[PDB]
Amino acid sequence: QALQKYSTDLTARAREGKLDPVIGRDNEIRRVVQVLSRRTKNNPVLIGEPGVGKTAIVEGLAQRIVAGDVPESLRDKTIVALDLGSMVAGSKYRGEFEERLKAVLDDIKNSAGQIITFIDELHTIVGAGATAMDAGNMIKPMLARGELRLVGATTLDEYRKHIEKDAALERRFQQVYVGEPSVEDTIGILRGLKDRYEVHHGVRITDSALVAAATLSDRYITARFLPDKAIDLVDEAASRLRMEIDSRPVEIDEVERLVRRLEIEEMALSLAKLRSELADQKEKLAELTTRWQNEKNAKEEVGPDDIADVVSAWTGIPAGRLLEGETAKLLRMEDELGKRVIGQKAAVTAVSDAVRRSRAGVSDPNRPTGAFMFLGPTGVGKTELAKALADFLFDDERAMVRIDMSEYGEKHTVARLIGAPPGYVGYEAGGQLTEAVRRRPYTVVLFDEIEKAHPDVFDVLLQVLDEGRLTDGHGRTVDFRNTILILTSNLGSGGSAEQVLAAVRATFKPEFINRLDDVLIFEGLNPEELVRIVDIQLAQLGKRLAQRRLQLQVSLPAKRWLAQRGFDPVYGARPLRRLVQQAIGDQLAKMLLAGQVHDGDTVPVNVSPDADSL
């Protein structure tokens, strides 16, 4: 009766059908039965990386014992799962634990070879009674005679920390190595569990969802292992579907809550403004509502789309079908990007191309998406281009990772981006390039001024470009599969179009230029196109003055006089920004803090033959 209170049963639960059907892995089952039926030293320890199924094998053995495919030897054995937490429960007195354990063991030894014990997580055997080691190695003279069959299941790396420390126990246990499967059998494992999820959520799951979630989840979520990493998408997609069985969908709830919020704020202020955005949002919410009704007049199952929406929600790399939500943006993308960068169109199209080939799935699945270096003279706008394609992909400007290779003058500064080896000073922080990516892995990475780095940083990114893995000091292999790398330079500012390709080849190696994508050349500027830069700069400086709601009224002769002063094409578009302040800035500053330009109406600017007044 001592086994009754301190231990449950599995075979009695298996006869009632409370275990999920265990599919595949006949080799490990036959190996466990082969180990388990020998004469002496008969207890397997299932060992593998966590998640691959090491309790499901024991439940499959329970299913086979209840069914009856076992041989004559293991005939009707009734596996009993023990505990180690409900035995050290209250034992503050001196001999209170030890007679308890010895009573359990005498009950196991008493019966006629029936009971096969099953301790899960057996690394807790070692530190049992903290008195001077007495407990845990009490069962050591009993395992050698083969008296309790003791099937266990511990992980791989919690084994050489505890059990290999105490190697007198280590030779009692045999070992069964359970490695993960591949996709080709994980599809078959998924297809058999598609009954219990229909019960707990009364919905229907298409087979296309399973063959998608096995294939799609192995490129994106790389922190888990193959069986455990693919069920969760199916379950959470079923929950996504069951949430919307409430009378409305999601967008309508979102919009209702949003407009209620803006309503609240607005009425509390009683700002205009919001008044408009209210109305617009009320138009939208109206339209959708009507659409909803329409549809009703005319969903209840999951498909291969909602799996992709789960994977796009978590680890926020979007990986859907492009269901028209951004297709109008991805066709108006060269047009949108040419609102902040003017000209250089032959290398704007070449960057738009490396995204539009990759949203539609044509590019190589295991290689970084965009890994290319663009260069030219100084002032063209090659840094402003990089901060303007992260502007509409992310609605951000600091979500990119700007790391700067003008500080890496010496050789040994490489370690600040890969972290210290194990045993030295900083071994908690890891890398700095690694740990910035491993959370939110979709950002854009810069490398400003690749010139002035020492020629040893180049041999670290030689495996970043081609096969997108990188290993930090710990051993977490982070992967740069779907980021966008950017390299800048200044080599050969105004030399030629062929001298510039003679200094690039002379500084790098014939194994590093080949790793790259298309190496681009930014051109110079033109005196005709300089006016449109002045337009954007004055628009920016007019937007800045919303602190005190002034604006500017600018005449065309001023707007072209500031363009005709954009001289010296050694410097590019940079000195025009200084010219804007030396004409308009300090003049308006002196005009401002002497009173008299209190906020409200703007000022007019006007030329006066050499300078310009206000």
Ligand X SMILES: Nc1ncnc2c1ncn2[C@@H]1O[C@H](COP(=O)(O)OP(=O)(O)OP(O)(O)=S)[C@@H](O)[C@H]1O
Angle at CA of residue 555, ends 551 and 561, nearest 5°: 115
10 Å Cβ neighbour count for 65?
A: 21
SS3 labels along 573-597: CCHHHHHHHHHHHHHHHHHHECECC
One-letter amino acid of 105: L
Rounded to an integer, what distance in angstroms lies between the CA atom of residue 63 and that of residue 60?
5
The least distance separating ligand X from the CB of residue 10, rounded to whole angstroms, comes to: 13
Quick check: 449 binds a copy of itself (CB under 8 A)? yes
Rounded to an integer, what distance in angstroms lies between the CA atom of residue 152 and that of residue 47?
9
Which partner from the list ligand X, a copy of itself, none does 51 bind, CB cut-off 5 to 8 Å by kind? ligand X
Quick check: 349 binds a copy of itself (CB under 8 A)? no
10 Å Cβ neighbour count for 340?
A: 16
Are 611 and 605 contacting, i.e. CB atoms less than 8 angstroms apart? no
The least distance separating a copy of itself from the CB of residue 510, rounded to whole angstroms, comes to: 6
Which partner from the list ligand X, a copy of itself, none does 90 bind, CB cut-off 5 to 8 Å by kind? none
Q: Which of 2, 3, 23, 87 binds ligand X (CB under 6 A)?
A: 23
Rounded to an integer, what distance in angstroms lies between the CA atom of residue 71 and that of residue 92?
45
Q: SS3 for 391?
A: helix
CB neighbour class for 526 (10 Å; exposed up to 12, middle 13-18, buried from 19) = exposed
**7 or 217: CB nearest a copy of itself:** 217
Quick check: 511 binds ligand X (CB under 6 A)? yes
Contact window for a copy of itself (CB under 8 A) among 107-115, 300-308, 410-418, 587-595: 410-418
**39 or 161: CB nearest a copy of itself:** 161
Site string for a copy of itself, 478-517 (x = CB under 8 A): ------------x--x----------------xx--x---
The least distance separating ligand X from the CB of residue 375, rounded to whole angstroms, comes to: 9
Contact window for ligand X (CB under 6 A) among 23-31, 99-107, 264-272, 315-323: 23-31
Quick check: 155 binds ligand X (CB under 6 A)? yes
The least distance separating ligand X from the CB of residue 155, rounded to whole angstroms, comes to: 5
Backbone angles phi, psi at 229, to 5 degrees: -85, -10
Quick check: 574 binds ligand X (CB under 6 A)? yes
In DSSP notation, 21-65 reads PP-S-HHHHHHHHHHHTSSSS---EEEESTTS-SSHHHHHHHHHH
What part of residues 352-391 is at the interface with a copy of itself (CB under 8 A)? 378-379
Site string for a copy of itself, 152-181 (x = CB under 8 A): ----x---xx--x------------x-x--
Angle at CA of residue 560, ends 559 and 564, nearest 5°: 130
Quick check: 421 binds a copy of itself (CB under 8 A)? yes
Q: Among 103, 99, 131, 121, which Cα is nearest to 55's? A: 121
Quick check: 381 binds ligand X (CB under 6 A)? yes
Number of residues that bind a copy of itself (CB under 8 A): 59
Quick check: 440 binds a copy of itself (CB under 8 A)? yes
Rounded to an integer, what distance in angstroms lies between the CA atom of residue 184 and that of residue 272?
60
Are 214 and 186 contacting, i.e. CB atoms less than 8 angstroms apart? yes
Q: Which residues bind ligand X (CB under 6 A)?
A: 20, 22-25, 50-56, 155, 189, 227-228, 341-342, 378-384, 490, 511, 533, 573-574, 577
Q: Which residues bind a copy of itself (CB under 8 A)?
A: 156, 160-161, 164, 177, 179, 182, 378-379, 395-396, 402-404, 406-407, 409-416, 418-430, 432, 435, 439-440, 448-449, 452, 456, 459-460, 462-463, 469, 471, 473-475, 490, 493, 510-511, 514
